[PDB]
Amino acid sequence: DKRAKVTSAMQTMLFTMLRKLDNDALNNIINNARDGCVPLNIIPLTTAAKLMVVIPDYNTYKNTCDGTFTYASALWEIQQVVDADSKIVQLSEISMDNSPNLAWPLIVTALRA
């Protein structure tokens, strides 16, 4: 009996991930090409707007993602930011002074601009 449940869960997860994406910019890319064969290592790179970056320490938070930013040839204004302990962080703290006092992996939740 459980076989029905798990086979159902396959395409259920499928269709709901579809809805979580379902859009037309995706359709805007599919027509720009041939019958459809396009690398899957590009789809979320374009038709997604919820970039999540895990920043390990200070010296990369300076040469990389900062306080809006551009990545994947787009624009990203940093939304709510959280540290490795799932706690909220304010951007002023990220500097050489207070750096040794925050949970290091800094997970950002940027949006597309």
């Binding site: 490795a84 302990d85 949970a103 290091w104």
Partner: protein, 56 residues
Amino acid sequence: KMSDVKCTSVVLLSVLQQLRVESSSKLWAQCVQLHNDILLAKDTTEAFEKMVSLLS
């Protein structure tokens, strides 16, 4: 008597993990650093220092 010190450090790390101290990151990182360095012990006094520093 490194045997007793290694065993004590193991049971101390066990009760520490049981205490649910996994909130912070660097604290538990250094804690397990001390634990990994006391389970590999060549001298009994070095293990002594790591054990006493970890007890608090």
